[PDB]
Design a protein around this ligand. Structure first.
Ligand code: TRP
Ligand code: DST
Length: 345
């Protein structure tokens, strides 16, 4: 059973996650495992009444829920389910938020027997005494069949102040042995996140994110499958020749200085009037790639029964993922809306 009730934040998000586990065709026991894992990772946030304000006005989601879901679609396959969480959200300030986040990661490392050495190497860069925003630590769990998840950690290059974003990023890459990786990154307006794959992965990466305030379709294809990426840009943007977007650049070896993965993240919630339009664009991309567009509709209804045209931001992002030696993947990011539905434009 669950100690959580539907009036508590943890009750709403574990109910959402359980329904999503069924879309992802996870069995009863893996579902129970991951539902409990989500509640544990939230700490005291799980038990917080939804009637109270969000403890932290977090960047993780627009309404400041410390949870976001995502579905990774491969051609011909049922989608893989992942969840992003902020373990330290129910903390009083950013320093304590980070401490609780690292504590949660250490607990996961103990339970699933993986090392935190690589993350440990970076602690002074990303967890200084008086940290700057906008966040301290997020964790993403890939909810794999079998109950042992894939673990990723997200860190803030601006932790030591905005003026040291590139200094921090570059020092982190050097410490990890990726001394040529920075040179492979495109021009950018921000370096909002650095992510690390923890534990078991066929090729664990460091992932560097770049914000582009005014990206064109041509630039997106250049930074990437040029044609695939430009087509995806137009499809999600509804194209108006530049849009806000993020690129992610994945490095899985320290030898060449070349990335092994590229992702274009399009914030479709910023481009459309309501989630009816965003679902339409996501469904069309999935369908055209031979992916499981029916499962997208089932996932949206698993999260919320509201009509899609009654708000915007349920479909937060649609992303096109290229990884050398794998088929393209499309990821749809889906909001919890535990605190607010953003009204349609
Ligand atoms: N909500 C934040 C962080 C975030 C959550 N999910 C994401 C998916 C892609 C890019 C960023 C994010 C943002 O829009 O930046
Ligand atoms: C959740 C955030 C901050 C960014 C989304 S990129 P991701 O971690 O979901 O990328 P992968 O699915 O791990 O390739």
């Amino acid at each position: 059973g669950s100690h959580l009730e539907p009036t508590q934040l943890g009750g709403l998000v574990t109910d959402q996650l359980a329904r999503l586990c069924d879309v992802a065709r996870l069995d009863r026991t893996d579902t129970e495992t991951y539902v409990q894992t989500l509640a544990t990772s939230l700490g005291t946030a799980a038990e917080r009444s939804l009637a109270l304000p969000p403890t932290t006005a977090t960047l993780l989601s627009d309404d400041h829920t410390p949870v976001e879901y995502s579905l990774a679609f491969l051609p011909g396959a049922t989608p893989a389910l992942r969840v992003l969480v902020e373990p330290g959200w129910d903390s009083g300030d950013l320093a304590e938020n980070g401490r609780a986040g690292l504590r949660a990661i250490r607990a996961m490392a103990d339970r699933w027997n993986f090392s935190t050495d690589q993350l440990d190497l970076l602690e002074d860069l990303f967890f200084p005494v008086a940290p700057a925003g906008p966040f301290a630590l997020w964790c993403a769990l890939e909810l794999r069949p079998g109950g042992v998840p894939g673990v990723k950690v997200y860190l803030n290059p601006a932790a030591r102040g905005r003026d040291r974003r590139a200094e921090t990023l570059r020092e982190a890459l050097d410490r990890l042995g990726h001394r040529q990786a920075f040179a492979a990154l495109p021009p950018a307006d921000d370096y909002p996140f650095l992510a690390l794959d923890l534990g078991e992965w066929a090729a664990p990466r460091v992932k560097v994110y770049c914000t582009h305030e005014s990206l064109s379709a041509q630039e997106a294809g250049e930074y990437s499958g040029r044609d695939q990426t430009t087509d995806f840009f137009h499809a999600v943007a509804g194209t108006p020749s530049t849009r806000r977007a993020l690129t992610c650049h994945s490095f899985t070896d320290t030898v060449t200085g070349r990335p092994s993965g590229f992702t274009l993240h399009m914030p479709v919630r910023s481009y459309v009037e309501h989630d009816g339009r965003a679902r339409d664009r996501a469904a069309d991309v999935l369908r055209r790639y031979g992916m499981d567009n029916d499962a997208l509709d089932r996932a949206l209804a698993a999260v919320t029964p509201r009509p899609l045209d009654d708000g915007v931001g349920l479909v937060a992002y649609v992303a096109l993922v290229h990884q050398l030696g794998r088929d393209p993947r499309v990821t749809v990011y889906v909001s919890s809306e535990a605190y607010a539905v953003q009204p349609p434009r």
